[PDB]
Amino acid sequence: HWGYGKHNGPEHWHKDFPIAKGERQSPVDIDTHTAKYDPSLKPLSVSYDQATSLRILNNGHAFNVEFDDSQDKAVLKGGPLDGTYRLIQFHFHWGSLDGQGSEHTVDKKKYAAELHLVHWNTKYGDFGKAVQQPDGLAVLGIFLKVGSAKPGLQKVVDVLDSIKTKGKSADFTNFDPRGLLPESLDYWTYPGSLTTPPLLECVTWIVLKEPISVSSEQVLKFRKLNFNGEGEPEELMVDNWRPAQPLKNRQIKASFK
Ligand SMILES: NS(=O)(=O)c1nnc(NS(=O)(=O)c2ccccc2)s1
Ligand SMILES: [Zn+2]
């Protein structure tokens, strides 16, 4: 099965998922001097006041926090988007060391981790249909740097011991993702793909300029998770990030100058 090890990592994915060598794969390095300011881009509208989290799951390559998306509770609109996108899950990618872990990079700089808030376009009726469309998903990406603790993250950090191995899940209600956002919503955007198999090219990426800071202790707890199932030999869940892919015939646009 695919994963992040030496024998089944990103460099091998293309044998089972040939779209890995596609025209708009992600992630990609954001060159801040060649990104184009676009004054036509609108501010992001993040409406998370009615979000309903349900549970947290270790899926063997990350942990997902899942939300109820049966109704327009937590939605993303505006920015480069047309239409309403519903939040369905968030997850992180992180490194074994503080100098790596993010998927996108900024002028080749890597961050300690990257938060992905995944949303789908409600005009396609369900998530499975949305992932088959070029504008079906919108993922909000937020960088994490190591510094002062993020109070909003601690609820997540404290439950990780309950889902240490693959396939474990726990109830995770009344979590407010607003506590994970930076102060500013300035962003870069480009058309891209999921960064894990099946690597579908259905994503409008929105990457926030301002990182959030988390403490060393907080990220350390991430690194104690396991890729393996219970009873299996222990493999720590670290470096679950895909390297930057070529930009090809794409333009990254900036919401700010
Ligand atoms: N890193 S990333 O692109 O946001 C994603 N990686 N895995 C994801 N999972 S997911 O959206 O629930 C998903 C699950 C099944 C098929 C397509 C997408 S999103
Ligand atoms: Zn992701």
XYZ file of N, CA, C and O and ligand atoms in Angstrom, residues 2 4 26-27 59 61-62 64 66 88-93 103-104 114-120 127-128 131 137-140 193-200 202-203 205 240, ligand 1:
191
model
N 0.368 2.368 -0.488
C 1.235 3.551 -0.510
C 1.456 4.070 0.896
O 0.660 3.807 1.803
N 4.715 6.652 3.242
C 5.776 7.656 3.238
C 7.137 7.033 3.523
O 8.128 7.736 3.754
N 0.142 19.027 -6.654
C 0.551 19.783 -5.495
C 1.284 18.825 -4.578
O 1.188 17.606 -4.721
N 2.022 19.383 -3.624
C 2.109 20.838 -3.470
C 3.189 21.442 -4.361
O 3.820 20.725 -5.137
N -5.989 7.601 10.470
C -6.316 6.827 9.273
C -5.091 6.100 8.717
O -5.185 5.576 7.612
N -2.263 7.583 7.963
C -1.217 8.433 7.374
C -1.291 9.842 7.952
O -0.354 10.622 7.800
N -2.375 10.146 8.637
C -2.528 11.394 9.364
C -3.632 11.203 10.398
O -4.121 10.072 10.492
N -7.471 12.824 11.124
C -8.488 13.735 10.611
C -9.444 14.141 11.726
O -9.858 13.248 12.481
N -13.245 15.264 11.885
C -14.362 15.244 10.961
C -15.526 16.117 11.433
O -15.790 16.186 12.638
N -15.467 19.648 5.611
C -15.748 18.257 5.986
C -14.701 17.694 6.934
O -15.022 16.873 7.805
N -13.424 18.081 6.804
C -12.412 17.568 7.716
C -11.197 18.509 7.734
O -11.009 19.246 6.783
N -10.384 18.408 8.780
C -9.045 19.014 8.748
C -8.048 17.963 9.242
O -8.395 17.021 9.948
N -6.799 18.166 8.816
C -5.714 17.273 9.210
C -4.406 18.060 9.106
O -4.440 19.192 8.604
N -3.316 17.444 9.544
C -2.008 18.083 9.463
C -1.030 17.194 8.693
O -1.256 16.000 8.599
N 0.046 17.784 8.210
C 1.281 17.136 7.800
C 2.423 17.707 8.642
O 2.449 18.928 8.904
N 4.025 20.982 3.397
C 3.985 20.471 2.029
C 4.286 21.606 1.060
O 5.190 21.491 0.227
N 3.541 22.711 1.213
C 3.953 23.872 0.416
C 5.205 24.458 1.043
O 5.449 24.273 2.241
N 1.856 21.715 8.422
C 0.895 22.445 7.581
C -0.494 21.902 7.907
O -0.682 20.690 7.924
N -1.427 22.792 8.172
C -2.806 22.437 8.492
C -3.626 22.533 7.211
O -3.477 23.548 6.512
N -4.447 21.532 6.916
C -5.314 21.555 5.727
C -6.768 21.466 6.172
O -7.110 20.475 6.834
N -7.537 22.481 5.835
C -8.985 22.469 6.086
C -9.654 22.178 4.757
O -9.523 22.978 3.839
N -10.301 21.029 4.699
C -10.789 20.528 3.413
C -12.277 20.845 3.252
O -13.043 20.543 4.178
N -12.665 21.403 2.112
C -14.045 21.804 1.880
C -14.525 21.359 0.495
O -13.714 21.300 -0.437
N -15.818 21.062 0.372
C -16.294 20.632 -0.943
C -17.459 21.490 -1.429
O -18.272 22.051 -0.674
N -19.701 14.782 -1.428
C -18.252 14.823 -1.507
C -17.718 13.922 -2.608
O -16.800 14.352 -3.319
N -18.263 12.705 -2.764
C -17.723 11.795 -3.764
C -17.867 12.321 -5.174
O -17.051 12.051 -6.064
N -15.196 15.402 -5.817
C -13.781 15.108 -6.085
C -13.533 14.726 -7.544
O -12.387 14.632 -7.988
N -13.144 20.813 -4.843
C -12.649 20.975 -3.478
C -11.937 22.312 -3.330
O -11.372 22.852 -4.276
N -11.971 22.819 -2.106
C -11.132 23.965 -1.773
C -10.430 23.594 -0.469
O -11.107 23.228 0.490
N -9.111 23.662 -0.476
C -8.367 23.367 0.753
C -7.675 24.642 1.219
O -6.977 25.268 0.416
N -7.934 25.003 2.468
C -7.285 26.118 3.134
C -6.019 25.562 3.779
O -6.138 24.657 4.607
N -4.031 19.823 -6.673
C -4.542 18.449 -6.519
C -4.566 18.036 -5.060
O -4.018 18.768 -4.232
N -5.173 16.894 -4.714
C -4.881 16.287 -3.413
C -3.394 15.955 -3.352
O -2.745 15.669 -4.375
N -2.807 15.968 -2.152
C -1.370 15.686 -2.070
C -1.145 14.251 -1.593
O -0.009 13.874 -1.335
N -2.218 13.479 -1.448
C -2.056 12.042 -1.202
C -2.870 11.300 -2.258
O -3.803 11.896 -2.834
N -2.544 10.027 -2.503
C -3.405 9.252 -3.406
C -4.852 9.324 -2.973
O -5.168 9.331 -1.762
N -5.814 9.405 -3.877
C -5.652 9.284 -5.323
C -5.148 10.496 -6.100
O -5.109 10.419 -7.329
N -4.730 11.585 -5.473
C -4.003 12.667 -6.158
C -4.853 13.387 -7.186
O -4.330 13.947 -8.156
N -6.166 13.373 -6.967
C -7.086 13.890 -7.979
C -6.851 15.391 -8.165
O -6.597 16.130 -7.210
N -8.595 18.213 -8.384
C -9.922 18.762 -8.148
C -9.857 19.878 -7.111
O -10.904 20.231 -6.571
N -8.662 20.404 -6.837
C -8.528 21.310 -5.682
C -8.156 22.730 -6.075
O -7.247 22.932 -6.879
N -6.412 25.504 -4.272
C -5.631 25.702 -3.052
C -5.669 27.159 -2.625
O -5.481 28.033 -3.479
N 5.062 12.937 7.014
C 3.962 12.525 6.152
C 3.573 13.636 5.185
O 2.401 14.008 5.064
N -3.566 16.768 1.783
S -4.985 16.995 1.117
O -4.835 17.225 -0.289
O -5.735 18.013 1.744
C -5.860 15.584 1.275
N -5.326 14.372 1.505
N -6.289 13.386 1.850
C -7.542 13.900 1.854
N -8.648 13.166 2.142
S -10.079 13.435 1.728
O -10.431 14.750 1.223
O -10.971 13.074 2.859
C -10.340 12.428 0.493
C -10.729 11.126 0.763
C -10.995 10.286 -0.324
C -10.862 10.780 -1.618
C -10.493 12.098 -1.874
C -10.240 12.937 -0.792
S -7.581 15.563 1.466
